[PDB]
């Protein structure tokens, strides 16, 4: 009907479009196979795990961002535990003697 | 047919409409319910470009959050970690100070 067949082309093109620009980072299925696709195969496609592989890469690209940042405090935490130990030791020995100079 | 025509139409417009509500800038003029109602016509003059725009403008906003907020707890660790070791020097010289008396 080309008025049919026209709609159908600019649906699978701009759907190509979009699945191309999220395509998560580990989806088995490669941006040049999703530009292959055509209308039957598009409708069969998996957007459920599409959605999920997206979530788990978000969770990786934001993880990174806050990389370094999360590595310098973990640092500080276990000097801090240090620190706070030979604090009560040093205490400890400072209130003995208060006590023994009498 | 214009049936295996007209489903093949439905069934794309279903998988469009369900891409574009769930990567939809929070911000973005046009509604989930919007989208989720949008004919064939609509769908195919969809504003593309500022949707990918204020998405890569929201994913931007969400990586400087994830890492200001990292930034902001490694901060306040060492900050922690500044008065501890403070406490510690004017304690450890104070223990000095009585070992000579």
Do not use: W
């Amino acid at each position: 009907l080309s008025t049919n067949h026209e709609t159908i082309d600019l649906l699978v093109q701009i759907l190509r479009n979009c699945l191309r620009y999220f395509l998560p980072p580990s989806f088995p299925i490669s941006k040049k196979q999703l530009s292959a696709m055509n209308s039957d195969e598009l409708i069969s496609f998996p957007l459920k795990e599409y959605f999920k592989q997206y979530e788990v890469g978000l969770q990786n690209l934001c993880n990174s961002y806050q990389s370094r940042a999360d590595s310098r405090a973990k640092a500080s935490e276990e000097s801090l535990r240090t620190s706070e130990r030979k604090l009560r030791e040093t205490e400890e020995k400072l209130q003995k003697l208060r006590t023994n100079i009498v």
